[PDB]
Symmetry: D2
Subunit: 33 residues, 4 copies
């Protein structure tokens, strides 16, 4: 369904926040050079 | 160098932000039904 | 440790293939439009 | 357009290729120890 668009492209949002968090955590570790 | 760690893993943050933006814009277009 | 660099930046590679596969399956479902 | 799905979820494949390449070059760089 074009809801199941919405839900899957939410789950986009969440895994690509979790991108952000792990590639923050890249930043912090690579500040501990 | 472990600065250039920081810069590439900022460029992580920015590209995995624009994940979030495009995969919101999924949500909006797949809302439109 | 710059081995656990290799492993995490493999786990980068594999997740960003599994990006490729899921965003192919985007293309397939948005074919069957 | 559920084509403008096809082209954007192509542009998935290409951005999540450029994931694969940069996060290979992670592995190679984090190889040199």
């Amino acid at each position: 369904r074009x809801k199941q668009x919405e839900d899957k492209x939410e789950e986009x949002l969440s895994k690509x926040y979790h991108x952000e968090n792990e590639x923050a955590r890249x930043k912090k570790l690579x500040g501990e050079r």
